[PDB]
Design a protein around this ligand. Sequence first.
Ligand SMILES: [Cl-]
Ligand SMILES: [Cl-]
Ligand code: NA
Length: 129
Amino acid sequence: KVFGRCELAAAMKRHGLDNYRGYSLGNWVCAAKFESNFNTQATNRNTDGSTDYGILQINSRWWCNDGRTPGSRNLCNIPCSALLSSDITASVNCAKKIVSDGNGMNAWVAWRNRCKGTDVQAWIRGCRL
Ligand SMILES: [Cl-]
Ligand SMILES: [Cl-]
Ligand code: NA
């Protein structure tokens, strides 16, 4: 599923990301924009053999099981395939564990490089929330 901007802001709010660990909804929508262009089916292979899955490009190195990332963990206790669903529940629940890990949203390199310190409220401007 490719979400609309406001559609994904609404879904992320409904699933409790709105100011989760102090990160406003715009930060989350901005991260999703640059990680997946709002596409729940986005996948990208990493140089180390791990794969990033879904709207927030969650890495099999630590967070999900895909059966092909040697020496990896599955700290969200989900198959990586769950992160590709039209239903964002698994991606949101896993993102809450990631952002709670100590480095906040810096876990998403694209958030650090493209969202951090920008006017992220632009991402939810005009949205019925
Ligand atoms: Cl957009
Ligand atoms: Cl594990
Ligand atoms: Na894994």
